[PDB]
Symmetry: C3
Subunit: 115 residues, 3 copies
């Protein structure tokens, strides 16, 4: 079975370091919250970034924590008026027998308003 | 086994009401057409909207019909000039043994012309 | 299980013919590299294209090679300084027993500069 894991986190400046730092933190927490201690069962990980962020690919933060074998893809989020700014969102596809209602999703910082 | 389910529907205007109503109808039809019993079978659902739609997130319609525990993600479609305007597209990833040739995709309203 | 397969290829110019030819080449190469002789194994295929490519949908290429029954979805890639121009990226979700470490990803033409 495949279960999606959602995550979201905000930053306060479109810089490679800031983008990477937040992404690394989110990915590590999404995995920790679900007791995942290996990357072998992640089918793929998809990232989306709001329009106000274009300095670096979030996928690079995944490479930084050793996810070089995990398929990654990034896309742009819809610029909805009044929507939360500077947000990095993640959708991990996890091969697991963990029930849908047992999967833990992670919303950090300002993204907590998105849960 | 995971099978993707595609859906597409158009709206006549860029308003939250129009977007949510259409997305709600599309999702319900996608579920109905494939006889899906519980949302527990859905690994995730991805939504995309064309550049001319920015008033709201289609994913909100999913919450309206009880998909609170289903992982949702939204993105922007490639802005190809001359393409069908105001389109909401959906890709559901379904855990099922259903063969690929038996999965039912749904194309509504003006998107009916987008069916493969 | 489900394993994602990554692919990427560049195009010399923004025209439907060029986009479709490149996408056909990449898709075929991704399947060949993984010994996939049938499309029944593909859960879905997601494409992303850089903003300098807007003349056509890469998904049309999938139809051309007979992937009508494969669920397809496309999205806009995130702009990044110094990133390779005119890039088509693919993420195929493959139903397979193949371990993550044995899935073959394909980077063609100038896209080799991204791998």
């Amino acid at each position: 079975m495949v279960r999606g894991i959602r995550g979201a986190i905000t930053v306060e400046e479109d810089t490679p370091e800031a983008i990477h730092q937040a992404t690394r933190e989110l990915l590590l927490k999404m995995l920790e919250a679900n007791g995942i201690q290996s990357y072998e069962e992640l089918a793929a990980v998809i990232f989306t970034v709001t329009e106000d962020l274009t300095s670096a690919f979030p996928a690079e933060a995944a490479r930084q924590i050793g996810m070089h074998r995990v398929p990654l893809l990034s896309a742009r989020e819809v610029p909805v008026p009044g929507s939360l700014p500077r947000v990095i969102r993640v959708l991990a596809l996890w091969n697991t027998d963990t029930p849908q209602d047992r999967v833990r999703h992670v919303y950090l910082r300002e993204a907590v308003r998105l849960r």
